[PDB]
């Protein structure tokens, strides 16, 4: 089951955060994504990772299509925008 929480990312994925991004939304056993506003990418993936998520500052919307859907795109969307 897949749900995201668009964030900005303030992270931007760029490696230190950003791979323990991949790593939590991948601890979830779900299909997740982010999703620039809308450009969504398997959000615990290279271009999860490196496309969207590394986008800082975009409204990316981290999804978790998993069992962990809600928990996984939630914590992952905070993640990105929610220290620094």
């Known amino acids: 089951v ?9 992270t931007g994925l760029q490696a230190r955060p ?3 991004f991949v790593q ?8 997740v994504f982010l999703e620039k506003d809308g450009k969504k990418v398997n959000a615990k993936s290279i ?5 969207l998520a590394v986008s800082t500052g975009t409204e990316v919307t981290l999804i978790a299509q998993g ?15 929610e220290e620094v």
């Open 2 to 10: 897949q749900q995201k929480v668009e964030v900005r990312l303030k």
């Open 18 to 20: 950003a791979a323990l």
């Open 24 to 31: 939590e939304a991948n601890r979830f056993t779900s299909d």
């Open 47 to 51: 271009m999860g990772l490196m496309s």
């Open 67 to 81: 069992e962990d859907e809600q928990e996984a795109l939630e914590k992952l969307a905070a993640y990105v925008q």
